[PDB]
Amino acid sequence: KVFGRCELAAAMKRHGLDNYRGYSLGNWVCAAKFESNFNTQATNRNTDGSTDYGILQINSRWWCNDGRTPGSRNLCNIPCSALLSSDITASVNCAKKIVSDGNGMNAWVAWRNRCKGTDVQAWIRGCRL
Numbered sequence: 001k002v003f004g005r006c007e008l009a010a011a012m013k014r015h016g017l018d019n020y021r022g023y024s025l026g027n028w029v030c031a032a033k034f035e036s037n038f039n040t041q042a043t044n045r046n047t048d049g050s051t052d053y054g055i056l057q058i059n060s061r062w063w064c065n066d067g068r069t070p071g072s073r074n075l076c077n078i079p080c081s082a083l084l085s086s087d088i089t090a091s092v093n094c095a096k097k098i099v100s101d102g103n104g105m106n107a108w109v110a111w112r113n114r115c116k117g118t119d120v121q122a123w124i125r126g127c128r129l
């Protein structure tokens with residue numbers, strides 16, 4: 001599924017990301033836009049042989065098992081394919097673990113480079129939240 005912006009905001013809000021670890025919802029929507037273009041089915045291979053999955057491009061090196069990243073962890077205890085679902089529940093639950101793991105939303109390169117220190121509440125502009 002490719003979400004619309006406010007559609008994603010509402011999903012992320014209802015699954016608990018708004019202000020999660022102090023990151024207002026616009027941070028998460030912004031991150032998703034530049035990680036995956038709001039596309040739950042996005043996949044992107046990394047040089048180390050891991051792959052990033054879903055709306056929030058969650059990495060198989062650490063967070064999910066994709067069958068083809070040897071020596072990696074599965075800290076979210078999910079198949080990576082769970083992160084490609086139209087339903088973003090697993091993505092959001094996994095995101096919560098990631099952001100709680102020490103580096104906050106610096107875990108998301110697109111967040112660091114395109115969202116951190118910017119007007120992220122604009123990502124929730126107009127939304128019925």
Ligand SMILES: CC(=O)N[C@@H]1[C@@H](O)[C@H](O[C@@H]2O[C@H](CO)[C@@H](O[C@@H]3O[C@H](CO)[C@@H](O[C@@H]4O[C@H](CO)[C@@H](O)[C@H](O)[C@H]4NC(C)=O)[C@H](O)[C@H]3NC(C)=O)[C@H](O)[C@H]2NC(C)=O)[C@@H](CO)O[C@H]1O
Pocket residue numbers: 035045046047052056057058059060061062063073075098101102103107108109110
């Ligand atoms: C090619 C490219 O850049 N692709 C992007 C992907 O990298 C990306 O996924 C993110 O990948 C990084 C690097 O593998 C990963 O970051 C690492 O995460 C772990 C786990 O949280 C850190 O380990 C913890 O460090 C803290 C603080 O030092 C410790 O206190 C804690 O104990 C550690 N936990 C464990 C289990 O060991 C690493 O320090 C950190 N490494 C680096 C180099 O930063 C992120 O979590 C990945 N992010 C996500 C969302 O999965 C993907 C998404 O941004 O985007 C690609 O473009």
Ligand SMILES: [Cl-]
Pocket residue numbers: 010011014
């Ligand atoms: Cl919703």
Ligand SMILES: [Cl-]
Pocket residue numbers: 011086087088089
């Ligand atoms: Cl959802």
Ligand SMILES: [Cl-]
Pocket residue numbers: 021022103104105
């Ligand atoms: Cl933080």
Ligand SMILES: [Cl-]
Pocket residue numbers: 024025026027120121122124
């Ligand atoms: Cl916000």
Ligand code: NA
Pocket residue numbers: 060061062063064065066069072073074
């Ligand atoms: Na893994």
